[PDB]
Amino acid sequence: ISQVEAQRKILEEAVSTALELASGKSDGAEVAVSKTTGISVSTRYGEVENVEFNSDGALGITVYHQNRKGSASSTDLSPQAIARTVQAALDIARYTSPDPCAGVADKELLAFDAPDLDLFHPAEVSPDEAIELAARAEQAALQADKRITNTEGGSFNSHYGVKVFGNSHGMLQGYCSTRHSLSSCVIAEENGDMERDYAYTIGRAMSDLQTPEWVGADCARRTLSRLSPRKLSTMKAPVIFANEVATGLFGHLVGAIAGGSVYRKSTFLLDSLGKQILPDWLTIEEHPHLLKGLASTPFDSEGVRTERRDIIKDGILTQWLLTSYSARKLGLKSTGHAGGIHNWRIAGQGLSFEQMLKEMGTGLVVTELMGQGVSAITGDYSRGAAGFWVENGEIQYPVSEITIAGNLKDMWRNIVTVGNDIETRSNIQCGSVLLPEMKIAGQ
Amino acid sequence: LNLVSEQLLAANGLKHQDLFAILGQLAERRLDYGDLYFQSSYHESWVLEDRIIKDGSYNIDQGVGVRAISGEKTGFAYADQISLLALEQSAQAARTIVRDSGDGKVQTLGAVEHSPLYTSVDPLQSMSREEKLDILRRVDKVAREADKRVQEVTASLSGVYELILVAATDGTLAADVRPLVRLSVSVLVEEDGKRERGASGGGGRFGYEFFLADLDGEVRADAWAKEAVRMALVNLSAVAAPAGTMPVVLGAGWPGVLLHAAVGHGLEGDFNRRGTSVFSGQVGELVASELCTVVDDGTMVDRRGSVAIDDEGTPGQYNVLIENGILKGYMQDKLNARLMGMTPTGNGRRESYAHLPMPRMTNTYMLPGKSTPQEIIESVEYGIYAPNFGGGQVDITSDKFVFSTSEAYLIENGKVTKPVKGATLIGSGIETMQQISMVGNDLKLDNGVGVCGKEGQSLPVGVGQPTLKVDNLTVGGTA
C-alpha cells in the first residue's frame, strides 16, 4: 500500500508534466500512464520450475493541432524522456492531415470526479508461498487417476496496477487495481491417444479464489472426460455452446456493433439498429460500476464516463458501441467504449445444463473452439470444435477433429434457450446456449 | 559488437568489467547457466485512410533482462532501464531460484564472428518523411484506379530499429543490429449494396526502398495495391464452400503456415523434452510421406524470419528437421538442448528483454519436388484449391490444427472453377503429412507477413512451400 501510493504520486506528476509541455504548442492533448508489478510462478511435478518478477511501466501521449494528430510513447518516465516524447508527438502532427473527427473527448462527457469501484485488494505473497499454491493445485490433479501420465504444470500469478489519465480539458484521475489467479493443466492417455485440459480460479482478492485442491480436481475431471474421442460424420444437427464458449458467441457482437466498423460499412449488422437481432426474451445488460468487477472501470481510455445500459433489450439492438472518433463520424456522442466493454450479464431462462441436454435430445455439445473463422463483414462462421455427442438426452462420447459452420445473423436470431449454468470468471457472463441447427463437417 | 557495445554499455556508464561482476553475483549460487540481455528499440508507423495521412506514431523502449538457470528451473527479473543498479537488482532477485552455494567458476567472456544477414543501416533515418508518405499515397491512387468498385483503402508503413547484446556464464558475448519494415494494404469493394474486403503486403530486414523496387516489371507497392483489389473482388463473387472430407491442393508461399502448425511447433525442443508432443521419441521414424523434406532456416539474407544471432548469441542455422519423411531432430534453446543431451540449433528466441527465451521457429519450409502445379490440379476429380490463407491455431498434445482460407476455389474434373467463401480446414498433423501425395517444383516463401504466438510471445517468422496435394482433409463449409 505504501509502494503503490509512492508510484501513484510519481505517475500523477508525469501526466501533469506531459500536458504542461504540450499545452503551448497544441490545441489539445491526452496522456495515459500505467505501472504493473507482481510475480508469476510455475511448477512441474510439484517442484518449482519458473519464478518471474514483473515490473512494467508506460507513458503515451496524443496531441492535436489544426485537427492534425500525432502520438508517441516511452517506458522511461524521467523528465528528459517525457520532454522527448512530447516533442516527438508534436513533430508528427506537423505532417499528418487535418481530420475534424479527431480530438480530445467532449468536456461534458468526462469523468472529472470518477467513482471508487473498489478494485484494489493487495496481498503480500512471497515467491515460496506462491510456489506452494501452484504445487498444491498441480499435485491434486496428478493424483486423481492413474491415466494422468504427464503435466503442463501448476501456475500462480499475483499483480497490482496503477493507471492515471489526463487531458487538456483539465481532467486528471487515477485508480489502483489487483488481479490474482491459480491454474493447473495435465495430460491423460488411453491407447496411444493423449489429451490435455486445464482448470483455474481468478479474482481481485486472494480470499475470492477457489482452493488449490478444487482447481486440481476440476482439471483432472475435465482432462479425463476428453479421452478416446470420435470424429463425427458430416451432418446437420442441433448444437449447444457450453457456458465457457457461449460467452465468446455473444462476444462476436462487440466487433459487429463497434462504431469503427459501422462508419466504414464493414459490419453485417450495418442496417440492424433498432431491429430484433436476438430472441424477444433476451436482454444483454452492461454494468461498468460493479464493485470489484472483473471488467469494471471508472472511465474509458479517453476519460469518458461509463454507464449502465441494456445493449440488447428484449432482442432489439438499442445502440452502437462508440468512441469519440466513431461517434463524430456518425453525428452522435461517445458511449464510453474506448478500450472495450465493461461487464455483460445475460440471465438464464430456467433450465440447468442437464435439462438442456434432455430438451435437445440428440445433438452436439461444444466445449472448446479453435481458429479465427468469423467474417466481420458477412457474419459467416466456420470454427474447429471439440466437445461431446449427445443421444437419448445423455452424453455418449467425446468428439474432436470436426468443424461447425453457419452465419451469426441466423445463429443469434434463432437461439432456443440460455441456461442458468452461468460462467462467472469472465467479462461476458452467461450460461449454455442451444441453437437448432449447424453444419458439422467431419468424416 | 563494438558499435552496439558503445550504444548499450558505454553510453549508460557500463564496462566489460561490470558484466564480470554481475555474472559473478549470479554464480554465487549453484547454477548451470546465467545471462544478461540488453536491448534498445525504436518503432514508427504512418497510416493513410480516407485519402489522407491520418496518423503517425513514434515508440521507444530499452531495458535489461537477467536469468539464472539450474536444470529445469529458471529465475528471471528485468528493468525498463540500462544501468548498474538495474542489473544488480535484477541479478539478486533472479538468483534466488536456488539457495545452495555454487563453485563460482564461469567461463571467460569472448566473442567470435558470425555471418552478416542484414544491414546495420537504420531504416527510420535512411529515407525522408515525405518519400515514406509518397509510398502510401501511391498505393491509395493505384488501388482506387484499379476498379470503380473500390470505395475504401487503408495503407500502413511500419519500421523497427533494434540493438541487442548478450553476455553469459558459458563465455558467450555477442550482438546484433536488427532492421524490420512492413507495408500493409486493405481495401473495401461495393457493388449493388454488397461489400467485401481484401488485403496484401509484406517486407523484411532492410529499408523502405524495397517497396519502390521492381517486382516482375512493376513497382512493388503498385503490384501489392492491385493484389488487395484482386483479392477483394474474388471474395465479393465467392459462393458457399462445400462441407466434408475431400482432396485439398495448397498453393505455394503463405499456405506453408499449415506446415508451420502441423509439424513446426511439434518439433520445438521444449515440448519434446517434456514428452508432451506427438513427435516425442520418434527420431528415425516415418512421420511424413517420403516426398517431404522440411527445414527451419535462420540464415536467409534480408528475410523477416532470419536471425544473424538468436537471443542467446547462437548464429542462425540451416536445420533439416524431416528428410524424405524421416524425423531427424528438434529445434533447441540452450536449456532444452542441455536437458536432452543435444546441442544449440540457433532457435533460442524471446519477444524482448522483459520475456524468457524458448525454442522458436525462424523461416520454416518444404523443399520442392518433381510435379508441376498444373499436374497437381489435373489429378483432382472433386476438391478445393487454396492459394491463400489467413491464420489459425494448433494443439500439439492431441495433434490437431485449424486454418482458415482467404482465397479458395472448387476443382472439378481437374480444372479450377468457382470461387468459394472462407472455410476452416481441420486435421491431424501427422496424418496430414502422411497424406501428401504430390509435391510441386515451385517453392516460394511468404512476402514478409508472418507473426507466430507461443506462451503469449509474438515473433516475426517466415513460412514456405511449393504447391502440394493433401489426399484427404476436412473442409468446414456449409454446402
Added chain:
Amino acid sequence: VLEDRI
C-alpha cells in the same frame, strides 16, 4: 495457445 497470423 499456439496462434499464427498475417
